[PDB]
Amino acid sequence: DKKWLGTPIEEMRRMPRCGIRLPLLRPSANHTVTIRVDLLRAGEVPKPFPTHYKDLWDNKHVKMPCSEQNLYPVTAGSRWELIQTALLNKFTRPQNLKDAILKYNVAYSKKWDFTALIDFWDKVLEEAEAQHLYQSILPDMVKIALCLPNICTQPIPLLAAAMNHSITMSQEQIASLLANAFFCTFPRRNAKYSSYPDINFNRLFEGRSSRKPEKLKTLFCYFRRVTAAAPTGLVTFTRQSLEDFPEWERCEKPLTRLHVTYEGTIEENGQGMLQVDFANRFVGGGVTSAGLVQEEIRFLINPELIISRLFTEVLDHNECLIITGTEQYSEYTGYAETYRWSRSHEDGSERDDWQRRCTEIVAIDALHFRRYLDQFVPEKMRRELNKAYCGFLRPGVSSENLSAVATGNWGCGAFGGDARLKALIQILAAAAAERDVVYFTFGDSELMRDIYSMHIFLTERKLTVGDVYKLLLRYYNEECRNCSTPGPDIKLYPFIYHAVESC
Template sequence: MVLALCTPIMSGPGSTRATGKLRQTKLPFTSTPSAGASEKLSDLDTGASASDNKRIKRKMDEGHETEKDPKARRSECATAAENRMKELASGVNHASDFLTTNKENDSRKGKEEKQLEASTSAEGEGKAQDEMSDFQNESEDNESEHSSSQENEDVAETESSNSKTLGRPIHELNTAPKCLPRNLILDRSHNHDVLIKVPFEYSNSSLPSAFPLNYQDRWDENHVRMPCSEKNQYPVDSEGSPGELANRWDLIQQALLAPITDSFTLEEAILRYNQRYTNKWKFTALHHFFTRHSGKERQDDFFAVLLPEMIRLAVKLPKICTKSIPLLKKGRSTKKLTLSQQQIACLLANAFFCTFPRRNSRARGAEFSSYPDINFSTLFQGPPNSRKMEKLNCVINYFERVCYDMPKGIVTFSRQTVQSSYDWHRSQDCLRGLHVSSSGTIEDNGIGMLQVDFANKYLGGGVLGHGCVQEEIRFLICPEMIVTRLFTEALGDQDSLIMTGCEQFSKYNGYADSFRFQGNFQDETPRDKLGRLCCEVVAIDAMVFRSDYNKQFKTNSVLRELNKAYCGFQSGEKEAEKSAVCTGNWGCGAFGGDKQLKSLIQVMAASAARREVCYFTFGDEKLAEELYEIHMILTSNQKTIGDTVWLIAEYEKKVVSRSFKRPSIRLFDFIKKKFGYSDSDFSSSGEPQTFDEDSNEARNTGWDSAVDGASPDHKANTP
């Protein structure tokens, strides 16, 4: 069957009708708008003035050009629509089976979800701060509300047995290494710094050789200020000449090579070359870890065996990293940096011993104030809570691994910048395939895909402080990601960072206060021809909307998030060589993003980048079904990315802008109504499901519970 070509969304009343095939199939929709919402939707469809549509179109048309070949794109959409109809026909029975299970669990889940909302609604507000100093200072208080997250984990485990999986089968999505190009080449260029000798061929028996052969120092604003630089001078008090400048690398070696028998002598050694912080740094958490948390036997083993190996690794810096590390700065074209895993381990050992100069001040105007912290002093300080103890467990496990069996691979870090904006509202690209599931995690089930890190603009967020949510946990179990904090400036609106080849070293469970190190992890992810693990993680930071929920639907906000996600998802490879995007509720926790809007934005951005999407809703079965339904409606009606952007703009104009609080009509309900679906289409029982905001249930659960389902977004509901 050949379906009708795409038509503009706002061309007239006829555009709101679904195709005959879709209407006849009778979709098993279960998420229904309230009775009041349905009336408002009807009023909007009949009462909107033509001038409203003209104003939206005029605003979005400014400064854009029409795509050159819309017929080809529409042909693609027609083909995709036929495939979606086949998928729909085969998926109705599966969806209907779930509805029965879901209905039986509604009562139990309602009580659990009310409790969960209280523990998740205010998580990690410290991550939403624009300045690094504010973020570091406030994260402990803001995330303390996660004390009940162990209960959340129990609920998530229970829900997994009733998980919802829809759309394209996950095994059919593109994954590495099978989709990688055959001619992978590692070579240095003006935009790719490679700190190992090339050509390079991975071997289990030998480490990559450093390049250049002898150390070359660059002490300037475009490179990391290396601890081993001759220009790294530090004032020290000595007999007869107070404040005399000395080579700091000599001080570091003298301090670390002296006997260190416990955490107190370790603190003294670190302060020898950080004297100005003698009265400021108190390594309370570090002392508690070894004296109370670990026990005497582990303390003795660490200081007698592991610590000397870590010191040897750190002081070999000028031989392992033989040139200054270039900074990945904002506002520049795409820049890549490739390091060996040994070089990363050496840099992290120096971070553990707090040797990096000019990286301890967070004051505005400081040279590296726009970079995250890298020295581990912030991890050692502060109250000895469970988060700090488990973080130290992960860090020490990493060093145990690399000191006794150094990995032989390499890792590439790529800062991508969008130079020219994608023409969203005129795009004729169709939406790509979607797999959506309420169970699974990005790191466990997205192997070989482009995995999304819900990042803070300062990469790693509070990984060295009190933060312990999605991004921090990923950095803890894959500590090689922490090294990005050394050379990556805060992300701008059109920046992303892709980390290719980072290895997982630790197992864990829990989240925030319930986070626990669960032992060593052997990462069996295959490697590509360059010796990198086929693990590609993209860090993209979302906007903050907690104080102004409705702002995220405005055109400028939508375009910013589209461009940010597109920046992370796009690449120069052929479409067949691009892996699927594996993501979840990006920016929907502390940053206050709307799950429906953010999920649709990510699907559009991935489609523009010619990638399919694997979406995990983390226990939110309602969102899984709603996203699948909307994707099915849009693709079956051959609606393009441009059409979808128009729909969001129309929703903002006709619904959001007319509300002083969160609108009662949700985005997905609005889209369904635009395509002519009645209440019976959205309900398995044929009766409309209503929710009265003024009812006792609404007052008891609060707005978020009513509109979001209040599900626990474990490991993915924070930026």
């Protein structure tokens, strides 16, 4: 019968009800703000700040396609002029789009295949859908792309490694930038930035692929929406890089509350909660290429997430990316080979006092364990604890103003994570950051039961974060360290129950 266990989800904190009164939005040395704060009003398109386009072409900012410094060989010509000439043409067939994009990407004319775009347009779309694509949607996307200088007037700093910095920009600004990414206009981003994710969409168009046409349905749902009517809100992207981490073994904090369920999703059932993105260290993973599991799906249904790839350097072990305000534009079914775009989604989230949707997503990247027992090594357990802790902690916020963490089987698919260990690691990290946990087991009812049982066992016995961490070290030292097979003799949760009940 029972679809969920533990603390009722109704009793967990959510935004906006739990939220702090926000400070006045203003640019600072650690907060870039690309809109006119004095004119920010509910339901109105934000006005760019400054009024006139200002350019930076350097290693600390986005290199904009509209920069006068974006050149091509003719003598040098303006590549932005070339982009305008190429894209201001009628498309009636997919080859026309391919030919346009290659005009200003000539070096890639033999490297970039457009089979997946062709298949989408010719072999997936209905003829009327393809007509609407080339008569309306693509031209509207070109226009928002080419409007970039008037939209994104303020240089966008890179969120580089070790930076603790925030960018608050409009949904409209993101739309223009993403349209540029679709048309593969971002310079210097294709090459042999090896520490930044891909931003141009060329790999969405390549190869023989069934996933890619569904990815394109999802993205075109977004582009149809934001070109039909400008979006009015803001989004904040924050890189957080922590210098000091808990002494896990000495941590005297109690565990927090747990809701665990095998039904539901992070994105639908964790509304208003801190929603985990099971991230790649290159945020967004393979969203611009072949990937289509939890991170890439979130980045497709909330495409404003994708623009993080324009400016977010590969995450180090002590870092995360927190994104507040992205909008959900699509609904879907399935994942990977079964992923399908379903329909457009009208996001009903309330907005906060900075006109951000009350949706907060944190990109935290688990480790990939090629050997299963490697993850029980103390250094590896501590790495995961500290990553999750970085993702959950909000310095200078009372615990009563923190939403619950909405998560699931972080790093337990392709990355080889043990779901039971990962659950306890996230429970410990949440406890240390003084947040409750809402855990979605994605159809695994036995895992739901197991996590519930262990959590209530540890809490009833009033074990601290440190107490639990020491039991993990015990498990490593007694069952794993000197273990001579791919799996240990005794499983982790049974081991913990015995160790505590024997004491």
